[PDB]
Scaffold this active site. Structure first.
Site, mmCIF file in Angstrom:
data_model
loop_
_atom_site.group_PDB
_atom_site.id
_atom_site.type_symbol
_atom_site.label_atom_id
_atom_site.label_comp_id
_atom_site.label_asym_id
_atom_site.label_seq_id
_atom_site.Cartn_x
_atom_site.Cartn_y
_atom_site.Cartn_z
ATOM 1 N N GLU A 91 0.814 -1.200 0.000
ATOM 2 C CA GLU A 91 0.000 0.000 0.000
ATOM 3 C C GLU A 91 0.856 1.263 0.000
ATOM 4 O OE1 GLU A 91 -2.848 0.540 3.243
ATOM 5 O OE2 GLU A 91 -3.715 2.159 2.112
ATOM 6 N N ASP A 116 -4.529 4.044 -2.324
ATOM 7 C CA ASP A 116 -5.465 4.607 -1.365
ATOM 8 C C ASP A 116 -5.670 6.064 -1.746
ATOM 9 O OD1 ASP A 116 -6.662 5.930 0.854
ATOM 10 O OD2 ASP A 116 -5.788 4.446 2.204
ATOM 11 N N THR A 117 -6.940 6.441 -1.958
ATOM 12 C CA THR A 117 -7.278 7.763 -2.450
ATOM 13 C C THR A 117 -6.803 8.844 -1.489
ATOM 14 O OG1 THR A 117 -9.475 7.537 -1.487
ATOM 15 C CG2 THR A 117 -9.282 7.062 -3.846
ATOM 16 N N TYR A 118 -6.896 8.562 -0.191
ATOM 17 C CA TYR A 118 -6.462 9.476 0.850
ATOM 18 C C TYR A 118 -4.982 9.815 0.656
ATOM 19 C CZ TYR A 118 -4.788 10.581 5.640
ATOM 20 O OH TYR A 118 -4.145 11.119 6.727
ATOM 21 N N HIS A 119 -4.158 8.782 0.485
ATOM 22 C CA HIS A 119 -2.722 8.979 0.310
ATOM 23 C C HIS A 119 -2.402 9.556 -1.068
ATOM 24 C CE1 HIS A 119 -1.884 7.117 4.128
ATOM 25 N NE2 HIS A 119 -2.505 5.996 3.774
ATOM 26 N N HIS A 160 -8.070 1.325 -1.686
ATOM 27 C CA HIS A 160 -8.709 1.857 -0.499
ATOM 28 C C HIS A 160 -9.415 3.139 -0.889
ATOM 29 C CE1 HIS A 160 -6.620 -0.103 3.254
ATOM 30 N NE2 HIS A 160 -7.636 -0.798 2.798
ATOM 31 N N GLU A 200 -12.529 3.120 3.906
ATOM 32 C CA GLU A 200 -11.760 3.314 5.125
ATOM 33 C C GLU A 200 -12.078 4.670 5.750
ATOM 34 O OE1 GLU A 200 -7.483 3.232 4.412
ATOM 35 O OE2 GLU A 200 -7.269 1.809 6.032
HETATM 36 MG MG MG Z 1 -5.320 2.704 3.385
#
Ligand code: MG
Ligand code: MG
Ligand code: MG
Ligand code: MG
EC number: 5.1.3.-
Lengths: 289, 289, 289, 289
Positions: B146, B179-182, B205, B240
């Site tokens: 990830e 992961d879209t957040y990251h 994610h 998440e």
């Molecule tokens: Mg994640």
């Protein structure tokens, strides 16, 4: 309004050479102002800076981030006192330079906390910041708290939180400093924080999502600048960018600048200057139509 | 494609009761799959998990983040060996559960490093991960690294870095987890990373910029899902979101959850499930017009 | 706030059959309200509408666009009067249904003008709309002018122009209707028009950039719903979509609906109802965190 | 890649004096190229243009939209023929100027049609365009079809429609011209059409959503320029803007230019030149990081 450039675009060491170099490059990039990162204000060569600023007809501001030793949000009064001491010297530097703006993460340590802020810690932070602001006020200096993301502080992560922080202190020279990079993470959008924080908004950092070239990331600059134009913000707009090409021994580690975002700060700086200025030019026409 | 929900939405402690509760809540929210956080795989009640999954007809995957003691990117072979042992056990857990996807931050400690990654460290990380992948491959388990932001790792911050990392190892069951957040921080945009890592993209994610309700932050989910549709991604898409009330003090502190963006996880989960599925339904129509 | 669906999702002919069909399908898709396009209110079967609305427990509103024969922005008083007569009948229909909202392009013809509006024409438009509004007022009907793009009117193309038009008339039941599809062309962004029009905003259309599936074009719904939330908008929010699979003899031509954007209106409708409701749910959560 | 400016930024009358004025202002704003609107190429003063171009060191392209009298999508062969004749003269004007690029709405009239295209009309359009392309090919001129919105054509509204239209003709000098203003309405997003039309994309218009200052509307320029960078586009990139301040007798009415979006075209032009150049500079950097 002064368009400014953060010092870490040019150098990581603010000695005599670094001061003249950053000031010179800033002016050559087309900026009105340079923001000196004063991580160690005790040794900052004020005379060289005054000389360089005068030579290039450039204005100045100062920013700083606290650490564990100087954490004003600590429960240890000795640690708090140390941080207050450091903040006061930074303000003194600004006074000698004839500058008007002090900002950054001065309400806590600039780091990844491993615990939430405590009641006692927050009280200590606000009290310390209040005393610094009062002192700065007598010196004709404005103090703006820079809102930063969850990984850099556990105290002020959003504009709303900053407004509640300032509500208690009720200091007239105490303001809010927003940064697009940090806003990109924590805020609900780019316009809401500007509008809510309108009275207190005193300082602005312009940074891309990955802190590199403007427009090569996910930050919604269009909405941000339009909101700035709507509230008639007339304070400093300062470009801030970090890359492994320019390293500050402590600051770069603290901000997690692992990657290369740019190798040529000259192209970067000139581009950023134009990006900011042109955006403001276009935004100014919006009220007319 | 399986629509999943991270177990941390529902509970912070994955014992017998927690496992049953998280599984049930996931099914009730409309999800196909639950992602179990195996921070401590040695104490994970695999049998209770198998039972609950079968009862609710739910699929399962597992993710974990390493720590200082189990950092495979360390130059200390004792530490590296410890991390590899933790990874191997987690893989064993998934094998027992009959699950096929292991992911998360397994190439380094999930934390804010105060130093850049080292060559020796990177070598150790790659070697350990390769061995873990080989072990997992024999058990028919895919391993996805990830990509996370600068504050959670100094190794893999972008999709391209993950690609270079994977190119060296050349493992068939080694994939990339985005992961879209990251992504919202480190990447240039939401479509380039998808297009660039299409061959290796195995796990996704779904998270808002501030890890709250989907659509209440700055993540460009529209571009992201359009890109997913364009490359015909058919892997797991897992929601998440985190609350300090729900998760343990340990993980809440690790993720820097200082604020709670929601009070009712039932409403959140159901909203997230609809958001993802409805977004996928919409993107499927694009090719028709 | 009532969540609605424009009738051209379901049928292009509002004979008795189309009326009952559109009402039923609207209810089944999950909406609270149907918006009847009353292109010809003289022949609209009020009786069938009342009956269907009661059977399905649905509210109703109506919209329309004028044509050359009914252009209240004409300099020709006979054309103006025919327009005014049509508008008056539409208001009467709504009164008989027990409805509260009339809206649409009622200040000009709904077409691509080949000439700018004229001082004399504008004065005719305002005066007629003022009389229509007063008449409506007595009946407990609100009248909202739909701001539409440059190819569908030469009078009100932005929220700001609608405000100036209303300022002259100073009518308390006269409001502004904004449409995301039209805003996407003419406005500076999706928040300013809402904030500027706050007092007067009374009706909303939710249309994608190409008037198909929501989230499959370029409209910035996120900024739009965030701004709606900020001003506490509680008027109707109505889905509006057009495809070659559902043809109104005049309206589909007038709006230039050349392409297939969808074949299955039941999927479209359920998707749109979920899109709008889920968006509003999420925005409400920004409030407290 | 030539960065250009459409002539209507400067003048609506291309008499000798207008030609000289437009070319001069285009040079002074910093552009490489001027795009002549050849609405009547029979009366265009080619000699003055050669002279002005030479004087200022500027390249040139031309565009036009057809009208009812010249509609090559008409079922009336005399109307088709008149259109094809106007097209052929426009190609000749370009040949005499030493230019390489013809573009615009040359496959139909540039207007609000009141009914969908017909199979027969389409077949006429294609044949006529094919012949115009063959003639152009012998003169070394590329022909690019501008995809425009529903209110300006009923034939080519999306990149994919244009692809299918080109596929039939299979002409090596026949390309697709995309315009961000038009894409902003009809396309699914700003990257898919670039990726889908990659080999066929030969000309680009840069236009804000409301055709005013760049960055003051809803066009997603960032996604567009990132997709351009990804396919390595090297054709013309031309600024296009319209305001009631500068009016062409015919064209400004056809385009529905009711509103003043700017008074000072010198500022507008230099802002746009910088906007486009600076965007390209930034996008170049993305592959390095
Ligand atoms: Mg994640
Ligand atoms: Mg900053
Ligand atoms: Mg509408
Ligand atoms: Mg164009």
């Amino acid at each position: 309004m002064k368009i400014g450039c953060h010092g870490l675009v040019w150098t990581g060491h603010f000695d005599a050479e670094g001061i003249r170099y950053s000031v010179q490059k800033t002016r050559e990039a087309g900026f009105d102002l340079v923001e000196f990162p004063l991580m160690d204000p005790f040794s900052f060569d004020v005379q060289t800076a005054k000389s360089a600023l005068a030579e290039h007809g450039l204005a100045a501001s100062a920013s700083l981030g606290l650490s564990d030793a100087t954490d004003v949000s600590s429960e240890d009064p000795a640690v708090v006192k140390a941080g207050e001491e450091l903040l006061n010297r930074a303000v003194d530097v600004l006074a000698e330079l004839g500058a008007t703006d002090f900002c950054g993460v001065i309400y806590s340590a600039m780091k990844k906390y491993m615990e939430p802020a405590t009641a006692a810690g927050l009280a200590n932070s606000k009290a310390a910041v209040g005393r610094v602001a009062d002192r700065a006020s007598d010196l004709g200096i404005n103090v703006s708290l820079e809102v930063v993301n969850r990984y850099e502080t556990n105290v002020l992560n959003t504009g709303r939180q900053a407004l509640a922080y300032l509500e208690e202190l009720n200091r007239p020279n105490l303001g809010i400093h927003l940064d697009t990079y940090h806003m990109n993470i924590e805020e609900s959008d780019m316009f809401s924080p500007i509008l809510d924080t309108a009275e207190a908004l005193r300082y602005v950092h312009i940074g891309e999502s990955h802190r590199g070239y403007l427009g090569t990331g996910s930050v919604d600059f269009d909405t941000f600048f339009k909101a700035l134009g709507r509230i008639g913000y007339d304070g400093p707009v300062v470009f801030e960018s970090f890359s492994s090409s320019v390293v500050a021994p402590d600051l770069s580690r603290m901000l997690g600048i692992w990657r290369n975002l740019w190798a040529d700060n000259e192209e970067l700086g000139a581009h950023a200057n134009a990006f900011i200025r042109d955006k403001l030019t276009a935004i100014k026409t919006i009220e007319l139509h």
